[model samples]
Target: STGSATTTPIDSLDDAYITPVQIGTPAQTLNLDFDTGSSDLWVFSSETTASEVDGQTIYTPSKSTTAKLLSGATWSISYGDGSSSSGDVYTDTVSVGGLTVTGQAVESAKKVSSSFTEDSTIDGLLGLAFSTLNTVSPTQQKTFFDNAKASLDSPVFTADLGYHAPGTYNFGFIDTTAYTGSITYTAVSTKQGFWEWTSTGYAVGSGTFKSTSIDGIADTGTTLLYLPATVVSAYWAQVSGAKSSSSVGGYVFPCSATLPSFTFGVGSARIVIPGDYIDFGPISTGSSSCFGGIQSSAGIGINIFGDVALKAAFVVFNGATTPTLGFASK
Candidate 1:
C-alpha cells in the first residue's frame, strides 16, 4: 500500500497508541514508549490498583535481580487529552533489541488508567527520543540511543513500522534492503536533542506559500503534523474553492476530492507530503474537525512535522555518533 497510514493502540481507537521498547531480563520484562518529544522510560508498578489501570504491562520488582528505587524523587505526566499517571523513580539495567545497558534510570508508576492497559504487545517505552526529556535528568539523562550507540555495528539507528494497523508499530534496525546510498548526516545541535529544522517555505502544486515562511523542528514524538495559519491557509488554497468552518476548526474538503500535494523545503532536500493527508472529516464531538493527518494546533508557535510526514522517508537519528537524520523510500 503506497497510501498514507494511521496507527491503532492495543485497546480502543483512542487507546491505540504507540508503546516504547520493552526491557528487563529474559524472565521479567517491561514495555515503554521511545518518545523523542520526551525522554523517559516509565512503567506501571504492582502497587497500582487493578481497577486503576487495566490492560497495561506492569513490572514486578521482586521478579528482577537488579532494580533499585531513587530515594525521594517521584514523577507524574499529563498529556493534552487529560491522560495522566504517576510513579516513583528507579534505576535498573534495561534491555532492548537484544542489547542491554546498565545503571539506567526508569519510572515505576503505581497509578494508571485503562487507557494504556489493553496493549499486551509491549511493556513500556524505551525513550530513545532524547536524553533531555529523560525523567532522570539532574544527575544523568540517558537514552537507548545514547547508551546503545557504542553497541551498534554502525553509528546509525532506524525505526520502521510493519503496517499501520491499530496495534502494529514494528521496531528494529533499519532494513538495509529498504534503501541504498549513504544517508546525508547532520550534527546534533547543542541547543537540545530534538531534530531541529528551518523550513524555507512550503510548496503546493508547484507553488510556494507566499507569506508563510517559518523555522520549526521535525519531531517523531508528535503523532500529527502541525503548521502555522499562514502556511495552512495557503495550502488549502491549492484546493480550489476550499472551505473551512468554525465547526471544523481547520480546513476540510470532500474525502473523495483529489487534494493537492505539498512539500516542505528542508535545506537542499524537498520533502513532499501527499494530498490525501488533507482529506479530513468532522468528528461526532464539537465543531473541531479532524484532518486526515495534517492539522492546525490551538496556535502553538512552531510547526511540527509528526509521524505522518516522517513515514514518507527514511529518518536516521544519530545520537552520540554524529547525531544525524536521514530519509528514504519504503
Candidate 2:
C-alpha cells in the first residue's frame, strides 16, 4: 500500500547486490537483519545524490536494465535514532545469483539524512525482526522469507555468516561452505514473524535466574541485549561488586572480575554467552566498565535479544511451509 504494485516469484538469482522493486508488489529480494527489535525493509536508491547518500549502497535503476519506477507513488521512513530517507515507489524484475524473480516492490530514496547519507557500510536495512513497525502494509508486507519459501532446496534458514564480524548479514540462502556440518536446530514458537523465545530467568556463572520464565524477541538490528531492571539487577548481583554506574547506560561491568558464562534455555536449546560479551570494555566517562553488550530498559516490557545472542548459533526462518523459525548450531 505504501509503495507501487507488482508480484515476483520466490526464485530467480541475479547478483549479490540488492534488487529494486516497484510499489504495490511484494519485495523480491530483501536484505533481512532478523532483528526482534524492529521490522522493516529499507534500501538506498540510485536516485539520491552522492552528498545525500554517502554511507549507504545506492541501488541505481539505470544500473539494472530491468529496474523500473512508478510515476506517482512516494515512500519515506523515520527511525527512532532520527535517521530518515524519502523516495518514490518503483518495481522491477529482480535477480539474485543469476536467478530472476519478477514483480518485486522497491523504494527509491530521493532524500536521506546524514546518518544514512554518510555511512557506506551497507546499502540499507531489511528488517526481519518481530516489531509491529512495517513501512510496507500488512497486506503487502513481503518479508524475505515470504517470497523465498518456494525456491530453497530445503527450508530457508539464515546462517548469520560471521567470518567477517558484525554487519556481515547475508540472507535468502544459507551457504553450507561456512559451516563444518549440519546446523543444530531448535523449533520456535508459532506467532507472528519475530523470532520470539522464552527465557527462564537469569543465571550468572552457571546458575539459573530465580524466575523460571521470561518472554523475549531476538533482534540483530539492536546493538545490545535489553533486559528488564529486575532481571538485569539479579544477573549483575552475581558479578564482582555489582556496582552501578551511569556511564554505560548503567549495565556494563568491569573486566577484572571472574564473570561466569551465562546460559539460557529455549525449549531444549541452551544458549551460552561468553564473558567477553559481558565485560567488554570501558565507558566514555572512563569510570564505568562497558560490556560488549547489555543495556537496562526498566519500563519497556519487551526484552530484546540482540545479535550477541544470535551470532553464536545458526538460525533458520523456515517459511517454506507455515511460517516457523528454527535455531541450529553454527
Candidate 3:
C-alpha cells in the first residue's frame, strides 16, 4: 500500500541520484537513476553489447524464474544530447524500496551510446514521469508508479532530496516530519509528459523578488537549474568576476568567489538554494575556475527547475487526473 526508498548522490558533485531496484525471481539488484523527466524503466542487462558495457551492473533476465519475454515488444529512448539506448521488453517481478510490482515491464538494453557507457556510476534509469512517454512499441508499458497507483493508499509520491548526500522518496503517503511549513501547491500540465509547472518570481540573495512567470519542468533527472537567459545573467551578475567562458562552455568564475544565494517562488512558498550549490565545481580538477550550476535554457526552448532547485525543497508529484505539484521547505 505504501513504499519508501533511499536515493544517494553518485558523487561529491551530486551529479545524479540513484535508488536500488530489485528485479526478477532471484532479485538482481541494480542502482538506477530515478528520472522524473522521462518515462521508461530500462536497465543494463545481459542483452547489452559488450563494447558498450563499462563499469556498471547488469541484469540477467534469463536467470530470473519469473522473467518472461514480451513477445515482439521493444523500446527505444534518446536524450537531448543524442545519447540513447534501445532494447526488447520483458515482464518480471520488480521491486523498489520493498514495494513489489509483479509483471512490471523492464526494458533490457541491447544497445547504448558512448554517453551512457561513460557514466559507469549509473546502471540504468527508472522513470517516474507520465507513462505516456514510455517508448515501448505495440505494447507501451506502464511506469512502476502507474502500475502501483491502484495499490497505493494515495496516488502521490514525495521526493526529499539532499545536497551531496542521501535522500528519501516515499510513495502513497506524505511524511510530515520530513519538512516544515505549509506546502504550496501549483497546477502542473502533463501535456508534454513532464511536470510542466511555473515559478512566480525569484530574488538574488537579500534582494526583492522580481515578478515574472517563468514556466519550466521540475526535472529530477537533470543536473542544473536552467532558466531564461535574463534570469541566469542577472544571477551571475551578482557574483564578482563571473563570466561566460567559451572554452569552459558555461558561466564560470573563481572557485573562491563570494557567491550569493538564489531564491525562487512556487505558489506562495519561497525556496532558497545555497550559494555553494551553484558553485558547482572547478572547470578542471586542479583549476581555480568553477562552473556555475545555474545556466540558461533559452537555447533549448525549455526552462528547467532541476536537481539544483529540487534539492532546496520537498516536492510532491500528485498523479491525479488534474495533476498538481507541491513544494515545501525541508
Candidate 4:
C-alpha cells in the first residue's frame, strides 16, 4: 500500500526535517528526523538518562502490549567527532503516515550526546538509508523502508522538500503531480550504504558548465550542500564580498552582496538552487556577514548534496531488487 508523511523542518535554516512517528500498541508519537545517511530507527525512550530527557517526547516500550525486547541485541551509532548515540533494541509496531510495519526494530537510546539534549528539535532518528548502515549488532535489523519494500506497490519512495515550507515523503509510488517535465535517471552506488551518485557538472549563475563527473551523496540528514574546494571556490568567487572565514565558520559574505544562483547536473538534467536560498541568515544577530548555504567539503571526507539541493528538486529513492535513484525538477 502507498503512504505519505508530512515532514516539517525544525528551523528556518532547514536544519533538519521531522515527521511524526507513531510507535507501540498504545500509540506514542515522536517527532523523528528522517535521515537518509544512516540506517537505524532509534528514539528517546523512558530508559534515557533523566537529565538528558529535556523536552523530547519519550517512548515507553514497557507500556505497549506488543513491544518485545530483542534478545542479546545492541546498537551504537557514532556521528563522528565524538558525538554519538548507543542503546538496546526492541520490536514494536511502528506507523508513519498510515504505513504500518509490524515487528519493526525500534532502538531505544540509553545514551545520547549533550548537543542532542540542548536542542529539542527532534526526539530521535528514523534512518531511510540502506540496511547495511544499521548499527544493531549480534543481529542487525532492517530499516522501516527495507521491511516495507516487499509489500509496497513498488519498492520506491520520493522526497519533495521546499524552501521554508513543509514537504511530503511518499512511499510505494511517485506522485506524478509532484514534479514537472521528466525525471532523469541515475545509478546509485550503495557500496558505502548511502544514496551516492555522481553529478554531471556545476555552473555559477549564468556561467559556463564545467564538464566534470563529481561523486557525492544525497544526504537529507544534512542541512546544506558541501562541495569540493575548487567547486565552492568557483561559486564564491562570484559573490562580491565573500570570503572563507574560519572565525565566522565557512564562507560568509556581506548581507547586501548580490548572490548568484547555482546549477548542478543529475545525469543530463540541470537543477537550479535560487540565489536567495544561498544567502543564509547573518553570522551573528545584526551582523553584516551572512553564511553561504553552499560550503567547502575539502576538510570533510565526502562531498554531499544536502537539503539545499534536494529542496530544489523532487528526489526518488528506488530500492527494488537493484537500487537506483531518480531526479525530477518541480
Off by over 4 Å in 2: 1-39, 49-51, 78-82, 93-100, 129-133, 137-141, 161-193, 209-211, 241-244, 255-258, 285-288
For each of the candidates, the C-alpha root-mean-square deviation to the true structure, in angstroms, is 5.3, 7.8, 0.9, 1.1
| Per-residue alpha-carbon lDDT of candidate 1 for residues 1-330, written as tens digits (9 for 90 to 100) | 011112334332122246444444443555455455556677776766677655666777666677776777666666433455667777777755445667677777776555556545545555655676565534555765566566666645564432243322223355566545544443445255466655556787677544344555556555566777666776776665466657655566545457777776544556666665444444444534344456665456556766656655566665543455665544
Task: Summarize candidate 3's per-residue lDDT along 65-167 as a digit string, tens digits.
Answer: 9999999999999976578999999999989887889999999999999988999989999999999999999988999999999998999998898998999
TM-scores for every candidate against the unseen true structure: 0.77, 0.72, 0.98, 0.98
The candidate 2 region of ten consecutive residues with least summed lDDT is 1-10
Query: Residue 53 deviation, candidate 1, in Å?
Result: 0.8
Output the worst ten-in-a-row residue range by lDDT, candidate 3: 74-83
Which one wins on TM-score? 3
Q: How close is candidate 3 to the true structure, as a TM-score?
A: 0.98
Query: lDDT by residue for model 2 over 1-330, one digit each (tens)?
Result: 011111111111100122233222242343322334445455676677666756454566666666666566665677544778776655566433333345555566678788766555446655555334545532334544344445545545453523114323333566565444455444455465466666655565667545567677766555556777776676677776656666544665665666666555555556566655555455654655555355565655577766556655655555444555555555
Worst 10 residues of 4 by lDDT: 78-87
> Residue 154 CA error for candidate 2 (Å)?
3.3
Candidate 3 local Cα displacement, residue 164, angstroms: 1.2
Cα-based lDDT for every prediction: 0.56, 0.53, 0.92, 0.91
Ranking by TM-score: 3, 4, 1, 2
